[PDB]
C-alpha cells in the first residue's frame, strides 16, 4: 500500500485516526535517544577536535599562501608571521589563557 500518501488521504486519515497508544509511548522514548544519539555521532570522533578548524581555517586559504617566496624581506613574514602570531598567540593565550581564566585550579599539572 502507498504510504507516501500522494493524495494525502493516507497521511491525514492515518494521522487523524492515530490512537496515540504507541507513538506517545515509543516516541517519548526515542525522542530521548534519537536526539542524544544524533549528537553522539558528531562528537564520538575523538579526532573531531581538528574538524572544527578544518572547515573554518579554510577561510584563511587566501592568507595561507605564506609558502610563497620572499621579496621585500619583511613581506615574507608578514604572511606567516601575522598568522603564527595572532593564531598561536590567540590559540595559545585566548584559547589557553582564556580557558584557565575560569579555572583557578591546576588543570594541567
* Domains of the chain (ranges, CATH numbers): 1-45 (6.10.250.2440), 46-109 (no CATH)
**Ramachandran sector of residue 73 (left: φ over 0; alpha: ψ -120 to 50; beta: rest):** left
* Gap between the Cα atoms of 57 and 69, Å rounded: 22
Q: Answer yes or no: are the C-beta atoms of 79 and 63 closer than 8 Å.
A: yes
Q: Which three cell numbers, joined as nine digits, stand for 104?
A: 583557578
* Gap between the Cα atoms of 33 and 45, Å rounded: 18
Q: Answer yes or no: are the C-beta atoms of 2 and 10 closer than 8 Å.
A: yes
* Gap between the Cα atoms of 99 and 15, Å rounded: 50
Half-sphere exposure (CA, 13 Å, Cβ side) for 16? 6
DSSP states of 54-69: HTTGGGGGTT--TTS-
SS3 string, 8-44, reads CHHHHHHHHCCCCCCHHHHHHHHHHHHHHHHHHHHHC
Amino acid at each position: 500500500m502507498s504510504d507516501a500518501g500522494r493524495k494525502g488521504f493516507g497521511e491525514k486519515a492515518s494521522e487523524a485516526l492515530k490512537p496515540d497508544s504507541q507513538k506517545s509511548y515509543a516516541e517519548q522514548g526515542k525522542e530521548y535517544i534519537t536526539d542524544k544519539a544524533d549528537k553522539v555521532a558528531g562528537k564520538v570522533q575523538p579526532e573531531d577536535n581538528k574538524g572544527v578548524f578544518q572547515g573554518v581555517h579554510d577561510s584563511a586559504e587566501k592568507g595561507k599562501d605564506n609558502a610563497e617566496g620572499q621579496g621585500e624581506s619583511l613581506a615574507d613574514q608578514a604572511r606567516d608571521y601575522m598568522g603564527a602570531a595572532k593564531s598561536k598567540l590567540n590559540d595559545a593565550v585566548e584559547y589557553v589563557s582564556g580557558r584557565v581564566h575560569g579555572e583557578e585550579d591546576p588543570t594541567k599539572k
